[PDB]
């Protein structure tokens, strides 16, 4: 049952994508919903390791990678990386299912997100410049591993000078919402599609 936090490497990309897929439907398995099992992790997980390698970690137990913990200390910096170094190769040759959500199937929402990324959420980026994401496989859930992992990431971002961080959570993931509330994160904004929570770090 022992889980350690280890620095992530490019050798972990495959496992990042797997964990991303297995938790990408508001925290639950999205495999049945996506037609491309890699897009999710290529949009939401892999670029953290490539663009912010000093704040990317995996959780690993005897069976192998059982989660990840990924951060970026500065939203503007990381968007530069996405806009100039990640989204362009991702777009090359990439089918565009059109901007109308009504015709989309499977991973089409993800293709559109790549061609036309969403605006950043309506929050105070000076107060909460850092951000991150955590996802544990069920085998590593329910026993404080998320708590220890969030301690690690909050500390790493604080050590980099970040005064606050925000995280995006699905409104249909009330477990994660309750998890963050319990850690002293407050709700910064809420739409029918997304909740953003934040905490000051210094
Ligand atoms: C910002 C994002 O990354 S959103 C996506 C989050 N990822 C997911 O939902 C993927 C699937 N689930 C997970 O990865 C994990 O379940 C996490 C990260 C959400 C939580 O990590 P876990 O290790 O499972 O937390 P655990 O359930 O053990 O609870 C840890 C603490 O929070 C408390 N807590 C946890 N969930 C809740 C809750 N839903 N409501 C109130 N308190 C809660 C627990 O009682 C415990 O309290 P304690 O430290 O005082 O004893
Ligand atoms: Cl979520």
Residue numbers in the entry: 3 to 204
What does the paper say about this structure?
Dynamic protein O-GlcNAcylation is achieved by the interplay of two essential enzymes; O-GlcNAc transferase (OGT) and O-GlcNAcase (OGA). Furthermore, bioinformatic analysis has suggested that the C-terminal domain of hOGA can adopt a GCN5 family acetyltransferase (AT)-like fold. Strikingly, close inspection of the OgOGA genomic location reveals an open reading frame coding for a predicted AT immediately downstream of the OgOGA gene. Sequence alignment of this predicted AT from O. granulosus (OgpAT) with the hOGA-AT domain (hOGA-AT) shows good similarity (30% sequence identity).
Crystals of OgpAT in complex with AcCoA formed in space group P3221 with one molecule in the asymmetric unit and synchrotron diffraction data were collected to 1.8 Å resolution. The structure of OgpAT consists of mixed α/β-fold, composed of a central seven-stranded twisted β-sheet (topology 1234576) sandwiched between six α-helices (two packed on one side of the β-core and four on the other). Despite low sequence homology, the overall fold identifies OgpAT as a member of the GCN5-related N-AT (GNAT) superfamily. The thioester group of AcCoA is sandwiched between strands β4 and β5. The side chain of Asn175, which is conserved among the GNAT members, donates a hydrogen bond to the amide oxygen of the CoA pantothenate/cysteamine link, while the NH of the same amide forms a hydrogen bond with the side chain of Asp137. The acetyl group of AcCoA forms a hydrogen bond with the backbone nitrogen of Ile136. Analysis of the OgpAT active site and comparison with the ternary complex of Naa50p reveals that His135 is in a position to function in catalysis. As expected from the crystallographic complex, wild-type OgpAT binds AcCoA (Kd = 8.7 μM).
